[PDB]
Motif scaffolding. Sequence first.
Motif, PDB file in Angstrom:
ATOM      1  N   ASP A   1       0.703  -1.364   0.092  1.00  0.00           N
ATOM      2  CA  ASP A   1       0.088  -0.095   0.003  1.00  0.00           C
ATOM      3  C   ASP A   1       0.597   1.471   0.049  1.00  0.00           C
ATOM      4  O   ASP A   1       0.267   2.458   0.283  1.00  0.00           O
ATOM      5  CB  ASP A   1      -1.159  -0.007   1.271  1.00  0.00           C
ATOM      6  N   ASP A   2       2.051   1.335  -0.532  1.00  0.00           N
ATOM      7  CA  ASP A   2       2.845   2.369  -0.596  1.00  0.00           C
ATOM      8  C   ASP A   2       2.678   3.874  -0.291  1.00  0.00           C
ATOM      9  O   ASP A   2       2.347   4.480  -1.349  1.00  0.00           O
ATOM     10  CB  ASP A   2       3.783   2.278  -1.785  1.00  0.00           C
ATOM     11  N   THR A   3       2.996   4.092   1.049  1.00  0.00           N
ATOM     12  CA  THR A   3       2.546   5.545   1.715  1.00  0.00           C
ATOM     13  C   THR A   3       3.967   6.475   1.902  1.00  0.00           C
ATOM     14  O   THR A   3       3.965   7.857   1.735  1.00  0.00           O
ATOM     15  CB  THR A   3       1.982   5.425   3.028  1.00  0.00           C
ATOM     16  N   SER A   4       4.891   5.634   2.622  1.00  0.00           N
ATOM     17  CA  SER A   4       6.054   6.319   2.948  1.00  0.00           C
ATOM     18  C   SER A   4       6.512   7.806   2.913  1.00  0.00           C
ATOM     19  O   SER A   4       6.689   8.193   1.724  1.00  0.00           O
ATOM     20  CB  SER A   4       7.244   5.593   2.494  1.00  0.00           C
TER      21      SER A   4
ATOM     22  N   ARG B   1       3.408   9.544  -6.100  1.00  0.00           N
ATOM     23  CA  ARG B   1       3.232   8.073  -5.702  1.00  0.00           C
ATOM     24  C   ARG B   1       3.011   7.868  -4.222  1.00  0.00           C
ATOM     25  O   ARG B   1       2.119   7.969  -3.600  1.00  0.00           O
ATOM     26  CB  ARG B   1       4.521   7.019  -6.066  1.00  0.00           C
ATOM     27  N   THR B   2       4.213   7.823  -3.567  1.00  0.00           N
ATOM     28  CA  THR B   2       4.239   7.445  -1.906  1.00  0.00           C
ATOM     29  C   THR B   2       3.183   8.220  -1.143  1.00  0.00           C
ATOM     30  O   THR B   2       2.658   7.463  -0.222  1.00  0.00           O
ATOM     31  CB  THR B   2       5.529   7.737  -1.402  1.00  0.00           C
TER      32      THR B   2
ATOM     33  N   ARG C   1      12.674   8.464   4.101  1.00  0.00           N
ATOM     34  CA  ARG C   1      14.093   8.692   4.480  1.00  0.00           C
ATOM     35  C   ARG C   1      15.171   7.903   3.588  1.00  0.00           C
ATOM     36  O   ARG C   1      16.154   7.583   3.883  1.00  0.00           O
ATOM     37  CB  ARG C   1      14.259   8.249   6.062  1.00  0.00           C
TER      38      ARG C   1
END
Lengths: 52, 52, 369, 369
Positions: free
Chosen positions: C11-14, C64-65, C17
């Motif tokens: 579910d790519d949030t990130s 995206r993220t 870092r």
Amino acid sequence: PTTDVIAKLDWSIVNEKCEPTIYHLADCQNWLPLNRWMGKLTFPQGVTSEVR
Amino acid sequence: LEADGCPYLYAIIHDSTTGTISGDFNLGVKLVGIKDFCGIGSNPGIDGSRLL
Amino acid sequence: MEQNLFALSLDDTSSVRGSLLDTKFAQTRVLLSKAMAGGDVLLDEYLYDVVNGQDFRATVAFLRTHVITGKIKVTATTNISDNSGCCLMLAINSGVRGKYSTDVYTICSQDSMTWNPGCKKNFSFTFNPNPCGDSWSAEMISRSRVRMTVICVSGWTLSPTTDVIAKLDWSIVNEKCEPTIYHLADCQNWLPLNRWMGKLTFPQGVTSEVRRMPLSIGGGAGATQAFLANMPNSWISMWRYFRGELHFEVTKMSSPYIKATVTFLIAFGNLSDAFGFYESFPHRIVQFAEVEEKCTLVFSQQEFVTAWSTQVNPRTTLEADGCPYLYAIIHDSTTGTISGDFNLGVKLVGIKDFCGIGSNPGIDGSRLL
Amino acid sequence: MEQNLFALSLDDTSSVRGSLLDTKFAQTRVLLSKAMAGGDVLLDEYLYDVVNGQDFRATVAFLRTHVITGKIKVTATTNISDNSGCCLMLAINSGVRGKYSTDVYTICSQDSMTWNPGCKKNFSFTFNPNPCGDSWSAEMISRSRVRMTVICVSGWTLSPTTDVIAKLDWSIVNEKCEPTIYHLADCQNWLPLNRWMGKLTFPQGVTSEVRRMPLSIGGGAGATQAFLANMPNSWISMWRYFRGELHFEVTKMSSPYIKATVTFLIAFGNLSDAFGFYESFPHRIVQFAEVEEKCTLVFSQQEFVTAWSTQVNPRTTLEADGCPYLYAIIHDSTTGTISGDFNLGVKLVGIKDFCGIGSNPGIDGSRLL
């Protein structure tokens, strides 16, 4: 520049622990001796979009 | 090259080259000692001393 | 195979870092010239418009993220050789109005920095587009059309080698973004606004200088009978006169081949530069270097612990000039050993408890600075 | 600003633990058809050639980060409805030779998996291109030109709705890649090779079947007086006969609407399918489901603890047939309630201590399987 500054070449010796250089046939090895000459890169002024 | 095996140091500038005069940059290259080098196999022969 | 991996590690949030390079994704040569008209913009692009399609370490996340929350940081590797230094500033403010403006008293002041085209190696400036707080999705400046820059004021009086346009690198950093605001209840510790007001075109020889200038503050600034409200100047007023230890940031956007030493303080802008012994007011000063250059200030209430006007009217006077400010005096016998001319910066990040009150029902007359 | 950040958080190496989606970067519809010629390739692309330019979560690293070291994992969301199941396999082996081959006994066997075009939701297969160990730079299969695939053998005898070409998703996973090899000193615990040998075109009605077949093993396989060496077959010989508990993996690439129950074992391939009571040898078997389908095997030395030949000569016999193998017998009265025909898989991942020895100076005659 200025002229032809030929400085002075001074030697004789020092009391240093001279290291006896050699290179192990059994190839895979820690450290490496040889030296390999390969520097310099004649770079123009301006900003020719280089990456030589 | 359009069949070039392996990765190496083939550099890219970054900054906008200068002099405020009439100059041209440069950059050295050398090999004193590695971090554990794997040599093996042999090369029965060629040469063709790469223009460096 | 089979798996409700519809959550998994998918579910790519990130808020990312990435190493400031595993974060790096920019590639645009910062412009640099000689035959140049004083203030020289080496561009003013956008945030998202900037480009569409840039192959780098942090990649899909640009869009995206989802969100992250550090400061969109930059470092542009520049330099030249040795002869003369210079000034530059990157523009970052808010959205836009119409056919707007393009200067150092303009484009920057929202959040900004100050640099020299030949100082040791590089300048830093960690851009976090949202002042309101921190965190961020793709829009906020996109659909809020802000555009950024890079440009002098001063310059390396000695025009050099070519047109070295260096590299503009950013993405972000894991820094504690500070949510900037300015307390209506005027009298306050610290101060935010920034205030643009540096440079001072200084001749060679030793013309017996002391190019005065006030310290009036208010709104923004001129242009040929035309002016300019900004964020370091107007909410930064409302009240009448202003009262606090603010301090500036001078720099050697001039020479390591041309020097000068110029005091900085609060005397009386009703004394024309030719005083008997001008070095006669509670001092602080220049004595530049090939290395040294950026300088600040500090002028409080042991000092002026009494009001002067963050305002003026095009018909305010000297031979009836109220209040003390920074109207400078050299010291040393100006130089170059060539064909040069000195300079000196000026700026206001944060004060020492500022007393603002009262108001100014209105005028303007944007003091030629 | 200034900083020897030339190291900082910039030298980007990262063997990457992106979430299997912060790792995801693929986008190619896995082909799927009806009017089809048995083995139906739904493609065979490349690794790096695959595409150049694919906007996804793990992005710059495809050719940036340097090296990583997990398994290039996949999951392709498919399905259809309910009526019939089917077989499919993805091709992944080594480099190439010339105008090569394209099958399930070919393209796969290097490292492989086995799936059905309508089973619950999806199949898994974590590809790590290097067998030699693990870790990896961009080249190793590029400049070592391998190409991959996806295709049946069996198929959903019931040809359905349209041509559902699903999605082929991969990148990697943080798994302990296992460095595959096969010990010359023949007699050994476990076994690597894989061996392709499934399916069995079974009629409807209840033709009194028992479609025998051996268990001979060696080299690879035929084609019209033409053959095929592979990795599950040749170093997987050298020795003569082979001796160990290997076991296969059957599956219902057939029907949840057509069933059958077929034993699996070791009797004697010198007994033609019409035996009096064929269910007469030390059993193991089918009894398929809408749900259930994939099956394996297990046949050792309490069982045959005596040699048979990993080899043969085009003129080897039955009415002089040495050794026991898996030559199957149904049980149940075959069905469909429609217009169908059954099937049954076969495979060899790892044995129970295999005795290989001796050698075979040579023949071939690639047994029609």
